[PDB]
Amino acid sequence: PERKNLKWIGLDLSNGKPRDNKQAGVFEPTIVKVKSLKFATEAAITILRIDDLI
């Protein structure tokens, strides 16, 4: 828990190393990505509840 600043190291989009994505790096809006996760899960439910085509 002392390393709470470590919450947000991610890959650099334009590079291949993990970077501290607040002190530097890219940001993406929380709403768009939280909705991305939500719609991804809803898709994975709607297409997985399928059983057969008749």
Partner: protein, 65 residues
């Protein structure tokens, strides 16, 4: 093979759009018709343009749109 037939189609769509996820991703040649060659590396455009042929891919792309 009644659910895997859907999972594999969705996985194929993911494999197609995967190589262009980030800003450094590769270019996709999408041809919905003969001669209409298009080269875009943003997966949203190809998803709007890729002519899915399987209803699972249909619904997944519909939710993406």
């Amino acid at each position: 093979t009644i659910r895997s037939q859907n999972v594999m189609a969705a996985a194929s769509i993911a494999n197609i759009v995967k190589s262009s996820l980030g800003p450094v991703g590769l270019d996709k040649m999408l041809v919905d018709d003969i001669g209409d060659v298009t080269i875009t590396n943003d997966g949203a455009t190809i998803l709007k343009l890729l002519e899915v042929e399987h209803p699972a891919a249909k619904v997944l792309c519909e939710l993406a749109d």
